[PDB]
Design an enzyme around this catalytic site. Sequence first.
Site, PDB file in Angstrom:
ATOM      1  N   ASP A 111       0.944  -1.099   0.000  1.00 53.07           N
ATOM      2  CA  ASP A 111       0.000   0.000   0.000  1.00 53.07           C
ATOM      3  C   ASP A 111       0.992   1.155   0.000  1.00 53.07           C
ATOM      4  O   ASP A 111       2.176   0.932   0.270  1.00 53.07           O
ATOM      5  CB  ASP A 111      -0.795   0.007   1.304  1.00 53.07           C
ATOM      6  CG  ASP A 111      -1.504   1.325   1.547  1.00 53.07           C
ATOM      7  OD1 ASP A 111      -2.252   1.765   0.657  1.00 53.07           O
ATOM      8  OD2 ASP A 111      -1.325   1.920   2.629  1.00 53.07           O
ATOM      9  N   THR A 154      -2.266   1.874  -4.953  1.00 53.31           N
ATOM     10  CA  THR A 154      -2.778   3.024  -4.220  1.00 53.31           C
ATOM     11  C   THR A 154      -4.237   3.328  -4.519  1.00 53.31           C
ATOM     12  O   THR A 154      -4.716   3.111  -5.631  1.00 53.31           O
ATOM     13  CB  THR A 154      -1.932   4.279  -4.522  1.00 53.31           C
ATOM     14  OG1 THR A 154      -2.244   5.307  -3.573  1.00 53.31           O
ATOM     15  CG2 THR A 154      -2.219   4.790  -5.934  1.00 53.31           C
ATOM     16  N   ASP A 173       0.356   4.991   1.139  1.00 53.92           N
ATOM     17  CA  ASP A 173       0.219   5.942   2.229  1.00 53.92           C
ATOM     18  C   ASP A 173       0.161   5.342   3.627  1.00 53.92           C
ATOM     19  O   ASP A 173      -0.724   4.552   3.965  1.00 53.92           O
ATOM     20  CB  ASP A 173      -0.975   6.858   1.951  1.00 53.92           C
ATOM     21  CG  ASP A 173      -0.817   7.620   0.637  1.00 53.92           C
ATOM     22  OD1 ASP A 173       0.097   8.464   0.530  1.00 53.92           O
ATOM     23  OD2 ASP A 173      -1.593   7.360  -0.302  1.00 53.92           O
ATOM     24  N   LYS A 192      -8.750  -3.138  -5.735  1.00 53.75           N
ATOM     25  CA  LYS A 192      -7.531  -3.615  -5.091  1.00 53.75           C
ATOM     26  C   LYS A 192      -7.407  -5.144  -5.167  1.00 53.75           C
ATOM     27  O   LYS A 192      -6.362  -5.669  -5.565  1.00 53.75           O
ATOM     28  CB  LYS A 192      -7.488  -3.158  -3.629  1.00 53.75           C
ATOM     29  CG  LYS A 192      -6.184  -3.504  -2.926  1.00 53.75           C
ATOM     30  CD  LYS A 192      -6.168  -2.987  -1.498  1.00 53.75           C
ATOM     31  CE  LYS A 192      -6.094  -1.475  -1.450  1.00 53.75           C
ATOM     32  NZ  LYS A 192      -6.281  -0.974  -0.059  1.00 53.75           N
TER      33      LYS A 192
END
Lengths: 208, 208, 210, 210
Positions: free
Chosen positions: B40, B108, B42, B148
């Site tokens: 991932d 992301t 962030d 995702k």
Amino acid sequence: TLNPGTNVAKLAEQAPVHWVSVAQIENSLTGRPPMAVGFDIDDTVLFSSPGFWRGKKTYSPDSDDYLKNPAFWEKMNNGWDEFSIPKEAARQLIDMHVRRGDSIYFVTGRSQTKTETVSKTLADNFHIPAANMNPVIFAGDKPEQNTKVQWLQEKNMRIFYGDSDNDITAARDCGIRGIRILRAANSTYKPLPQAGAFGEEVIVNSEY
Amino acid sequence: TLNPGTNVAKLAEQAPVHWVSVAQIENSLTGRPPMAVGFDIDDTVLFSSPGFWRGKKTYSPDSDDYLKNPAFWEKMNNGWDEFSIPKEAARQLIDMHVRRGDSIYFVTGRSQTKTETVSKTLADNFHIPAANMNPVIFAGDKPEQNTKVQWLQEKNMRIFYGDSDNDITAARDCGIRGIRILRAANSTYKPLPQAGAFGEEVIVNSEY
Amino acid sequence: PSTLNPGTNVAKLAEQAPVHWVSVAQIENSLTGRPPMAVGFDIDDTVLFSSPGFWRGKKTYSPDSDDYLKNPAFWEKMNNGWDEFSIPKEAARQLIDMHVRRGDSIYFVTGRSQTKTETVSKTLADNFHIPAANMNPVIFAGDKPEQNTKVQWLQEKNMRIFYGDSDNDITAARDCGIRGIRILRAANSTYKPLPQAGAFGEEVIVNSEY
Amino acid sequence: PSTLNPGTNVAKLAEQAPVHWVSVAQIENSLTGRPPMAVGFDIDDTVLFSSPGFWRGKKTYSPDSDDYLKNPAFWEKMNNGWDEFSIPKEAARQLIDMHVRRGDSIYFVTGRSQTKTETVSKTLADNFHIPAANMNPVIFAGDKPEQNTKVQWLQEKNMRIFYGDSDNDITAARDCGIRGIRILRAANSTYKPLPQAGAFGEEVIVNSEY
Ligand SMILES: Nc1ncnc2c1ncn2[C@@H]1O[C@@H]2COP(=O)(O)O[C@H]2[C@H]1O
Ligand SMILES: Nc1ncnc2c1ncn2[C@@H]1O[C@@H]2COP(=O)(O)O[C@H]2[C@H]1O
Ligand SMILES: Nc1ncnc2c1ncn2[C@@H]1O[C@@H]2COP(=O)(O)O[C@H]2[C@H]1O
Ligand SMILES: Nc1ncnc2c1ncn2[C@@H]1O[C@@H]2COP(=O)(O)O[C@H]2[C@H]1O
Ligand SMILES: [Mg+2]
Ligand SMILES: [Mg+2]
Ligand SMILES: [Mg+2]
Ligand SMILES: [Mg+2]
């Protein structure tokens, strides 16, 4: 070094240990029919240091030679556990396994004596029902004795609980699940072992 | 309640979390051939709150609508990561997967933009070789892009690292190993998630 | 760092550093009855998580060293805009709010180099909602080696309390005979190594890292 | 609380109660130069982990209650031998060793019911190797007209410091205007709930649970 101080990195630092709770252990056993499980005794289900402390003060003030004295064991196994304090973590584990109808075995490395009241002390303190209770097993290297590993296989224990390294290695030599219990900081059996040193599960808050 | 005090039970209390270290993860992969793994972005590999903080103050002082403002995203994905701080835990993980010859992917949930310099920033801060590097993947419910989960499957990623709950459940839905990273306490993305809420492995000291 | 499974034990789990922790409420309580006074705050890692700017600064001017800290071009950018990327600390909002209620005069003393113009004062006043009555323009003390530039300012403005994350912030307060209170530096700050909070026996504010 | 996988976060992991921790070394340093004085120690869970005796006592005279604490037969056993099963604390050894090097007079004050004879004093002197010049017979404080309260004894012997784990040990020191220091009560003690150490702003000795 009078005022060492600290920092937040240090305050949040965690040892890479696999912690677990009694509830998680129960959950992992969902659906499994009754089975045999075993517990080490000293510092696992009982804080028995009071007796070991008196024994040391009585036979080996400046050493641990009292652990090999027959007079110490006669008294330790026949009454001194009346001063042993049962651990709350053990109380929860035992209640949990009793609800499941599992067979409970207690394996100890204490020197075997002609008689013993440890079994009675355990059954009363933990209110173990006759159907789940079994006499304390004294394992050892003697010829008339069976080692801890042999007893785990013999009784077909699937889980073994203990605070010491030899408790975990015994379980691993049998291919069964060994779960670590934390030894209280005020135990007289030092140094404290490193819980998690074998990548095993360790029960949270199990020091009392 | 000016002085709430504390006690030793509180001091040693532990949450039943399964902590792991980078070394342990590495050791758990010995013998396995290079594979595809994903991160991932962030709060997993980059502390990007600086950009989002300014984004809100510039576009939505009173709400989270800046997250919908394409002008914000143009800025975030094309330069504001120059103020983003690389996480040391990610550095260790990335260097590890590189040594293995694994194929690294970054997924992301950020809004997609015509151009983006995030890939470059990532390859540069972590010294990711061209052989292991891969352009950032932007995912979402936009019918023009995959979700995702779909991206994890399509690239056959075997391990996915993330700080959020959806990062873990995504891995879980794919049947792969989902490993949690701790979100720094000073991150502007609140509230902090409960690392370990799914019984997943959590990397120690991974908040920085 | 060389042991795969180091494990742990309960004595280690409960181990505490001998530090004097305090909370904002306790600080406020110890000030009851005191008339408005002058108080000071260091800026970086005390009131603002400003590492984002120092990080871009190093990458831009000194990737291989710390020469950027002596570069006038770096300071121009840092003091006139990059704090837009600085994240305010909650522990600081609480202290500033507490002192505003008391009606104290708030000062900000920084070691950052002085520049012709600066927007830092405005950023601080806006992010922390500081009334003009309690606000004072930021004092740039600079940073001269082998000397602590902050002492001079704490004395002249008669500050009775100084808040800071660095050792020189605490020693500065000690040199003036005033109450120096420590704030924890966040673990993700780029200013390493982290200092040992409580190293002078001073009060350390709990959970002040964010 | 009942959640199976509660998880955690880094703010909770780093959270600290605002407590004033001190070490034995800091205490000694704060006494430097001061001449010999009188100091007191509470007994149970301060210098001795005595729960073994109380556990056996309750199991023997009050299986379903706390009535044993009122039974004379229990106290006879407890004050004349059951402390052979009491485990001395390490924090206590360090403190007593230090006061002995200083030459201070050491007093032990207990809320235990008084009996005609007692071997507790002997147990303490032997366990902690206290020289005859620094040792004093255990003081049984209480309400009975034949005795004095804890507060009265601290005053009568002019003790300057008093160590204890319970709240009334700390408030007794406060009432006399002397320095009260808290010892952590062990988690496996049977005297529960555990008290909130530092609830009065007092200094709390680190790692004093064993
Ligand atoms: N010094 C000691 N103090 C207290 N208990 C001890 C000490 N040495 C050994 N023991 C305990 O005695 C037990 C003997 O058998 P075990 O190997 O099962 O486990 C041992 C410990 O629990
Ligand atoms: N208030 C916020 N502060 C910082 N980051 C945020 C904030 N809100 C959203 N984000 C981040 O923006 C990201 C968008 O894609 P993700 O869903 O992968 O993860 C989201 C968070 O990491
Ligand atoms: N490497 C660094 N990363 C982040 N901030 C830094 C670094 N080096 C110095 N600083 C900051 O620069 C500030 C200059 O003035 P101060 O001494 O008040 O405090 C200093 C720190 O907060
Ligand atoms: N349940 C218990 N378990 C252990 N110790 C106890 C218990 N109840 C009372 N005590 C102790 O008995 C002591 C009597 O005198 P104190 O008030 O000094 O301190 C008391 C406690 O330390
Ligand atoms: Mg054992
Ligand atoms: Mg994330
Ligand atoms: Mg600073
Ligand atoms: Mg007591």
